[PDB]
Design a protein around this nucleic acid. Sequence first.
RNA 1: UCAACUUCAG
Lengths: 257, 49, 115, 528, 8, 49, 82, 428, 67, 44
Amino acid sequence: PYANQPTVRITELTDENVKFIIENTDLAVANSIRRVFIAEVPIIAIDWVQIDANSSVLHDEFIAHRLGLIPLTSDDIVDKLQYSRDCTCEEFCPECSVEFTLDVRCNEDQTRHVTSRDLISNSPRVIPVTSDDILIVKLRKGQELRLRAYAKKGFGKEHAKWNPTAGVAFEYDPDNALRHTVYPKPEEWPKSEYSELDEDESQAPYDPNGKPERFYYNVESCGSLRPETIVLSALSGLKKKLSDLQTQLSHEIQSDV
Amino acid sequence: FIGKIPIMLRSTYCLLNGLTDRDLCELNECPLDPGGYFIINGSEKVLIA
Amino acid sequence: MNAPPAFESFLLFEGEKKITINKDTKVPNACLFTINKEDHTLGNIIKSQLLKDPQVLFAGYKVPHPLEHKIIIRVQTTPDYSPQEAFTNAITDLISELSLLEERFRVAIKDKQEG
Amino acid sequence: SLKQRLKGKEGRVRGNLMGKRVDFSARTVITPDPNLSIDQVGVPRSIAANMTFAEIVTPFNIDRLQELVRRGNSQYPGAKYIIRDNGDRIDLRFHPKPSDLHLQTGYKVERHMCDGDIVIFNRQPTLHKMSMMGHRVRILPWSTFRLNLSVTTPYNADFDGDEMNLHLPQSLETRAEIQELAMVPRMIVTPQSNRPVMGIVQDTLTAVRKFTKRDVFLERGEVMNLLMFLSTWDGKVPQPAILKPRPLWTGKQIFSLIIPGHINCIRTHSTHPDDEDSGPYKHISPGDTKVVVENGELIMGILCKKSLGTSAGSLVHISYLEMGHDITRLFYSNIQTVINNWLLIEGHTIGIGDSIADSKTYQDIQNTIKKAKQDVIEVIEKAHNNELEPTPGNTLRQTFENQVNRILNDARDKTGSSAQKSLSEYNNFKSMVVSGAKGSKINISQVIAVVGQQNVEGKRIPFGFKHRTLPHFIKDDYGPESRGFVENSYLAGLTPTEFFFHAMGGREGLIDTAVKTAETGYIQRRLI
Amino acid sequence: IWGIGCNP
Amino acid sequence: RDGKLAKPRQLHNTLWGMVCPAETPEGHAVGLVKNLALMAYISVGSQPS
Amino acid sequence: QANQKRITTPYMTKYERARVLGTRALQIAMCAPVMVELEGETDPLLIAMKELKARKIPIIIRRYLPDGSYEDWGVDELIISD
Amino acid sequence: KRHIDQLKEREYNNYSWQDLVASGVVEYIDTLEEETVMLAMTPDDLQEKEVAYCSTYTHCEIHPSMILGVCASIIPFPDHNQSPRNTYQSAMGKQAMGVYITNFHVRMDTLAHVLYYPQKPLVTTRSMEYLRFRELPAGINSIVAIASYTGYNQEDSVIMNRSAVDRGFFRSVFYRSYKEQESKKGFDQEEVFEKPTRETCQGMRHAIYDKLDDDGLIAPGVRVSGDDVIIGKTVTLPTKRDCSTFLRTSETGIVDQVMVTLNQEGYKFCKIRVRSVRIPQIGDKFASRHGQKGTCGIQYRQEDMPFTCEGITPDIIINPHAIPSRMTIGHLIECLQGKVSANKGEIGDATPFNDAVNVQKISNLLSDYGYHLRGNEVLYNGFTGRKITSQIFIGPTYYQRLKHMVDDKIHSRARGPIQILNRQPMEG
Amino acid sequence: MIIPVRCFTCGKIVGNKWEAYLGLLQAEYTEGDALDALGLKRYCCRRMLLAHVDLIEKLLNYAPLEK
Amino acid sequence: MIYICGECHTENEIKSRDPIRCRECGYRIMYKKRTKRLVVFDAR
RNA sequence: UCAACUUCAG
Ligand SMILES: CO[C@@H]1[C@H](O)[C@H](n2cnc3c(=O)nc(N)[nH]c32)O[C@H]1COP(=O)(O)OP(=O)(O)OP(=O)(O)O
Ligand SMILES: [Mg+2]
Ligand SMILES: [Zn+2]
Ligand SMILES: [Zn+2]
Ligand SMILES: [Zn+2]
């Protein structure tokens, strides 16, 4: 009547990728952890743009869109920063946001590639993952882009600009033994990378008592958060959601009594 | 002088005729624009065969 | 023009309860928990953990409409057990499992590095 | 002239009196919504904020209406106008009007359209009376009208850019008249053909056929999840069909909970062997064909368009004729919801692998085509040597054309039968054809085996050039390839001449549709 | 597009 | 376009290579408005002398 | 006509039901006294439906025969279609 | 070979098509001469000696695919689709959103749609090169799954990925241009561009006139909501009448460019262009290159969309029930070829009558890159994580955003303006 | 018009890779080999660079409104 | 206000009821020039 | 403003 004790084994850990295996866990828990990776890990990204001068070919809201999609280092202070809604101050302040500035003019004849490097942040911890560079716009001679932007904390449920991850690869039952997918012709199907079967055997024998366990994950970071801390923040955020739910449930049960 | 005849764009009598793509860009015309239409009262009209 | 704001997906508007509990009259010892501003992430976790409990006769969740943001969880338990207690125990078990996962993931990180 | 003002369409008599532009009407694009009921329609907030319903202030609704008036036109659940007893319309949009916000009995608050309002829904042309039906409003985000997919067939609507008109009754009297005479559940059975107008369609039909196979076995969690979407559920989980070794319910066992009351029906599945009824296993039916619903429980059978579709004697028709229109509405909605979630589990697709056939099948198709071309060559030689003799009532040209057409059609049918034999159980073209959701065996055959003869004006492709069809063919060639026969399948790809001939056939079909619309419209107007 | 007895 | 005769609209065999078989408007103008094929050219005229 | 020599159907037609319910609804919305004891129903159409079920709508339908004669059938006398 | 080698060196060899005509290699034939000419579709297949059909070929087609026009030439594998579907695709490709011209910034045209990120097709016909479809493409390649996911793709609708849409997928700009000319008709009656005054000008409206500049014209870069006053024009009344132009209702744009010139008459003439950035909604219409369109049924985020083992979630989910009745097999072959091209790095060739590109060859190529021959893929349910039992056909297909959008079509009426003659509600 | 930041399907940053892709194409690398060198693995990401048409260069030919 | 010239791209200030002709080039197409007030764009 | 035209949607 109680929760199972999961186990983790990390196979690969690189600055861009974490490949790990979670065993003795439910499919619902595993899938929701993946879902939280995608949508409920807080990150820092530009959400306020004010363009003082835009003579580039791209219109202002095109530039704003591209600026928002630019990833920003959010490793440590995203936990410290507050949401704009939570912050007491009106509009935005150092605690609820980070300020960026762009002042680029193509005085020279050669085309000027405005990059993420040209974005200058007021706080050193958030930088546009520059330490090529993301190209915001190309400026012909006599064309100038000036803007001020504010970057706020948020998660991918609001907007895909706040997705901390690129591709979460989630696989269970690498050799089809629970028959959750029924192949019309099993032999035509390529073997998985995690498959332990011999080349002759296309599918493992049907396991009637089996349950999905030993889930395999490959989480690729977008660069804003380290791939390890994406997973850690996702686990902590899911636990916090459950704890908030429990608090409200206890309050309403007390109210009913 | 007896009248004025509308000139089909990029025809032999159009100003854009015989101009390289750089010259067309200097005049704010597209190099890729086919021509074959008339500008009458500021609107592009195409004679349909 | 009729696009809902994005923050509607998870932010409660003023005067909205996160959880509302309504008993189910059709069957004895059954309850229906309506969670507002929640999605399949919490619903599937809770339904699975409730199914693991032997005294829970029925556990299910549904999103009544994809465009709206709500979760309805029906829980029916055996006599001598309360569906509200089953819900609380499910949440606590999931919290404990997730904390254990966190600890072991931190240990695995520290071991993959530094060796 | 005065005559021209009154004469035709757009004249006063027909364009302004028999029909006229009306207020309280809204048009927008329609998108599907499986989650809405039959009678429910989905209305964007902007459309609901512009359109209003006047509600008389009574002692029992004065508080709610005064709150709505306080909210005003800006906040959505509000009121646009207040009509006094004198008829003076206080405007809530323009300026607070604090003295004029007061309501007394007899005032009319023009509140915004809310959930539960009855609205007429229309699609042009209104060919029959099911094209205008009464729907209960539900306000949903975004800007499209959202309607249940069972209601698409009466409206002749698909969600590919179609739009629907919406008319809001403005009086309680006309609201009651609409609700009783025109509500969607009351329109299920048409008087035109004494059949249901609406049936299970598209994904739900295919997924119902898959769901009601003998093979489908559902574990405890899946059963609970599906029962969650059954609104009429009694709260009691049926005892599973297989108690040991592991408790596993059956698709039929759960679908038996959908069927309302105690409904008795006997149908037959589309792939029902004609031999089974005569021979043994009448009531065992090795293929799980036939359909027997006793006491509202699906004892045996696989459901398709013959059981859950728009046909006389269907489970839907029997439900309407026996349990009533309200319970039938619930029946439709529950079928759609729980079967769509099971389809989320099982899934459905179409791919290239469906179009591919066995190598032996392709070889047989090629042999059949070779034999047919040889037989057409033999017939042409008989005609050239004057051995052919005219069929009574036909010229030699006509009898030759009929013989060649018969040979080509027989070969086409044989190739189609070979392709259909090739189809596996897992084949998804076959799944959709068997369920009746979309497609036909003709389409499967053209996809896999042979596109068939391209014919214009009821004859093979005419000799448009001088005594030949295309410049590539020699003059006086009556063989299959020259006159339009397409031996390649769509998957194989048409050769250039076959491509042009196929374009000729498609053009003829399009012309037929376009010409048909106007003549049929004139006939319909005359009859009415 | 099928045959003479079918459709164009 | 008003004429309902299905003779003038049908794709004639002589349209091969000179008018697109696929590209036609749908409605009152099926087969009445056509489009040149890619390699089609239209004679400009010459003196027969 | 009289209670005798009533030739029209005893059952209330769908059109009569619709118009009676709408008319009673409009009267109820116009502060007309309500015959049935409403069980917390504040919608005039729902109250009219409730009265129709209880056969307490105070309306008599005058059905015009094609010869010009009329028959007065009370709502209570008519058998409810649903 | 001499002619082909010289044409291959075309530039800096001064050899062209006219030299090919002058050599007598090619000839122009009209319909009357087409009646008297024996043609071969291909040289190798037909001219070469075989069982002799014809031994008097007088001409040969340069390529069969040239029988198609401009709009039908973009259709990939048109010989594998049903014929009416190619007509539908021609009609719909005339309606796709893309960069219509490169000088679109200079032009002030009413009703201009331009797409953010156009892409060239991964599966392309050769004749597209001569249509400049690479230079000015209209549509985006998109990962498409042909599946029945939640019932919101049923009939002809399409489910879309909201995360992809949020990353710039099919985002467009709609430019609306308004023209107004100040003119003098009466000797004492003239129209002047000016900011209308509540007291000085008799005609006024509730609409804000503050955004108007001193000249009476809104400056560029000012947000203008529906019914705001773009241009302020007042007529002297023989005090003043307001003829100021207003935004079309629900335009809700930002002014892009305001040009002030003199027309032929010499009167002042003003053109104001308004940008509205339109993100895909759940009413907008998207169509493939194979004649099957559909509105967006619903938008699911990346967490909700089904995912493969690699983590790929379809940008677009189309109902499988579209394929069978319509028999647009070119759609399936294009998905397979696009998968092969994207994994290989080449651009697929979909010329109509290639005869060197079978479906089997594409399948064998796809097998080498680690995927199923037929393009099916094991998809995991986004909501529950369980593998979908039926493996689902996924691949990169080219999709076009048609100009028909729901925001332009949504309308409602409630006691609005009324005609003078009929005294009935107005039209439009 | 310009290389999109982030692949639509997954969200991996592809905006920094266009100039490197063009340079690798200039080197000698085939399109597939250049895509592999840049690190694009899933066909969703390879579609972004492979199918991209850079119109910003054509638009930069026109002279700016204000100089 | 101040109108930028279409061709020579030099700002010229033209009063109301004055012919639209740029000084030093004579081009008859002017552009209104971007507003001083600034509009907030959500990067979304 | 109203008439006319053309182009589209289903
Ligand atoms: C199915 O019938 C409908 C209706 O009858 C209505 N309709 C459409 N055009 C007209 C018209 O001109 N005049 C009148 N009176 N009615 C008209 O439209 C018909 C179909 O047309 P379609 O055949 O193009 O529908 P796809 O098969 O093409 O649907 P995809 O796959 O694109 O979504
Ligand atoms: Mg349609
Ligand atoms: Zn702050
Ligand atoms: Zn990607
Ligand atoms: Zn100048």
